[PDB]
Structure formats: structure tokens, C-alpha cells
Amino acid sequence: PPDLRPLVPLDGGRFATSDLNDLYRRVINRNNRLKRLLDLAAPDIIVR
């Protein structure tokens, strides 16, 4: 849940981001890239 990984305001106009958010973003980006590559009928080495 987002509250357990809050995006606390930085009081200077920025946002302090927890490491869990970065890990989730990386996982989501990798999953989306793999989905696109699979939908593109990519060869064996690239998809592996």
C-alpha cells in the first residue's frame, strides 16, 4: 500500500522518494519492456 511507502514532501519543492518506490518502478519498467519485446516477436537471444 502507498501509505506504508509514503512520498513525503521535501519542503523545498522536491519529493523524497523511498527505495521501495524505485524498486517497484524498475520492476514495472522491466515488465513493460519485456511485454513489448514479446509482442514484437523478438528472437531468442533478446527475449532471453
Partner: protein, 162 residues
Amino acid sequence: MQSWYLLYCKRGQLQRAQEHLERQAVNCLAPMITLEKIVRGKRTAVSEPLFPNYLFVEFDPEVIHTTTINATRGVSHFVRFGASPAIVPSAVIHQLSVYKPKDIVDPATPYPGDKVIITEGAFEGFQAIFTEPDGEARSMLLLNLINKEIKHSVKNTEFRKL
């Protein structure tokens, strides 16, 4: 003998790595397609590669060492399984040379006549039907009011695809 290897390149540095490798006189292959991207809202015809951030370099390790290619500017790392770097068979290279698809890309999601959500200005958070950039930096949409939708041109960077 010359062999094929797969290289992961840095984000947006494929071209620079390509020129650097061509400077070192090693043959390289990368899928290439010219098509219509939106590019921050301005519908333009430019070239992007299939399987982004990937290159196929044909070279002999005897002539030039693997670590030299690994240290080439613009190249992130060799695509390796296990300790040794992966070897791309010639059949895959042939298929890639015949591999010619026509598709679209995620930045190119909004094409003529589809649903686009405006999230800025006096019309923030609404849905419209987008058809065409007029000129380059001006795109119009079927802006929706309480009664009906009317065509009107708004700034390109304000709206995003659903």
C-alpha cells in the same frame, strides 16, 4: 574468425556508440525504422530502432579484445549469459536482416482520430478525440463541453494518451 555478439547500450547513446564502433572498424547491425513519432507533442517523421538499446557487433576477439569493446564510449555492457559473453548464431543475423515489421511504439500511442486526455489549462482532466497537428507545435482535439464537443487547437504538451 569473426563472430557476432549482442551489446546493451546506454539510454539514448546508441548513435554515439555506433559512430565510435565504426571508428574502430567493427561491423555492427541494429534494426532501424523511420516512422511518425509524437516527440513531446509535435508529430514528426524520425527514425528509431526496433529492440532499443541493442546492437549486434561482428568482430574477431583476436584482432580486438572484448574488454576494448566493453570500454567503448556509449556502450553499456556485453549481453552475457554465464561467465562468457553470448554468441549470436548467423541464422539469427540472417533472420534479422530479413526481419521487417511495421508497428507502433508507446511514445507514438496517439495516432489520427483517437482518445486523448487533456490534463492542463482550463480544460484539465477531460477526454477528447485527437486527429492532427496543425503545423508542428499546434494539435487540435474534439474538446468536450457540457453540451457537445467542438474541434479546437491546444498546446501539444498539455495532453497525454489515456
